[PDB]
């Protein structure tokens, strides 16, 4: 629950990863 | 004997001299020492990649290692344990606790409130208090850019706009004073400066202002300056934008910001220049001309067209900003609208001690017998002249005037006590605050100021300072002055700015936060313990200096490259 | 405040105009 | 410009004779 | 875009995450 998969961020449940970087 | 010259040149505030003497040197470790001095002063100078040691001088100037040395000293003191707000001891008390927690745990990336999941704390706050709660995360993670962003990123995708704005502000805060070369802040924040929601604009613009306060970046200024002319920008957004532009362009005399500010003033109705967020426009202007002195007449002449009531405020603030470092006796005679006048007296007088003592006497007289409206600003001037300097007479005066029946004198006196004692564990002051907290129980606003002062006293658990001066009290950090002035000018309307929606401006203090610790290195930048005689006794470094102490190493084994044993010093062998 | 405490040679005490006389 | 002693200060429009207005010498 | 990543050019849409 500390990273995001490719898009889904499962903590915030934001929908549309190298930590905070774009890569 | 190169090191002295760069001090004198930095005092002269001339870029050309700084770059002239920072090169034209046949040694490297001397250049590393000068790079440490420049990094402490917040000056970054661009070097050609063909200089002998470009990589290390650049790495030093950007304070990349500051976090690691600070945490090393935190390991020497065994003070890594978090301090919850109740250890120091409604929505307004949740917000007060969030601020205490942020101040106390500043620069240690640890916390017992903003844990792995911070929603449990954030949703106990509401609206702007929740915004400042989310913003405090970036204050706890100060100077830890990589870990800071790794922790903040989760909140950048929140559905709640206040939480997202606070995360944006945190992302800006964590980039203050570090000037890393990848630009994480411009890439992350720059899409929201013209967002549809005004809260997003405020968060993004204040974050960008704090992240880039050091240097007048042309791209960031070109990005921000349009936002004051946007018809959707509120007066609060225009004010915050002027603050950001003046911080970024502080002391630069950048003409495009100047002209944009003058245009934004000339457009505003005589009914709107009554809005107190309008006071941030000439504040940004003065920041743009801070310390430039007699050159300011051209703008005083340009301001002649502005409405008469606003004119007095703009002219006074810009004039006292232009002379902030001058210590001019005649401008002090002229100042002896009124609130900014007394703040300008303090702002000018702080440059020399005799003027500062005469100012202290004046401020005591004004607090005792001054105009009922004029005395409201006097405690803020007392704060400004003696930040992180726990004088007993000043604290006694403020404690006397801390019960005053006029609420704003009380608020400002309490805040001034918290500021004067900031970054010091002074037990007298802590006991005073505890007693005033027992007296002002059942008084939400006075209690809020008391909690802020309590948190500020323990700032960094005693390891941080807010004083603008450094290196033998002879060099003034303009970014520290800009942050302090932002806060105190916002406190000239404490009941509506600070106790209203916009208390997030308190985070402007991060621009002035600096370490008060001494560190010695070998010529390889490796921790080299030595023994020192700290006067005005012995300890094993890294040791903490207080406001007016001079530290001497008690053997002739080593010789320091800089004559001043402040901050980071490289030590040679016999 | 109430006034004990200290008065800077303001002696009746007349420490300030905003304190009880 | 003086003051009369409750106390009244016209020159300050404040409500809560002193020899000196500036320092109130008794 | 003045707000993107290509890692980081010398070692993606940040806002949208597209």
Numbering used by the authors:
A (entry chain F): 33 to 38, 53 to 62, 102 to 108
B (entry chain A): 261 to 349, 367 to 613, 649 to 848, 866 to 903
C (entry chain C): 1 to 3, 27 to 34, 90 to 99
D (entry chain D): 34 to 38, 52 to 62, 101 to 110
E (entry chain E): 29 to 34, 50 to 54, 92 to 98
Wording from the paper:
We assessed the structural impact of MC1 binding on PSMD2 conformation by solving a PSMD2–Fab apo structure. Comparison between the PSMD2–MC1 complex and PSMD2 apo revealed that association with MC1 does not alter PSMD2 structure, indicating that this binding pocket is preformed and not induced by ligand binding. Moreover, this site is accessible in the 26S proteasome and situated adjacent to the AAA+ unfoldase, suggesting that it could serve as an effective location to tether substrates for targeted degradation.
PSMD2 serves as a docking site for a number of substrate remodeling factors on the 19S regulatory particle and interacts with the ring of ATPases that unfold substrates for entry into the proteolytic chamber of the 20S core particle. Here, we use mRNA display to rapidly identify peptidic macrocycles that bind PSMD2, an essential component of the 26S proteasome. Determining the structure of PSMD2 at high resolution either alone or within the 26S proteasome has proven challenging due to the relatively small size of this subunit, the preferential orientation of the PSMD2 particles in ice and its intrinsic flexibility within the 26S proteasome. Here, we describe a new strategy of targeted protein degradation through direct substrate recruitment to the 26S proteasome.
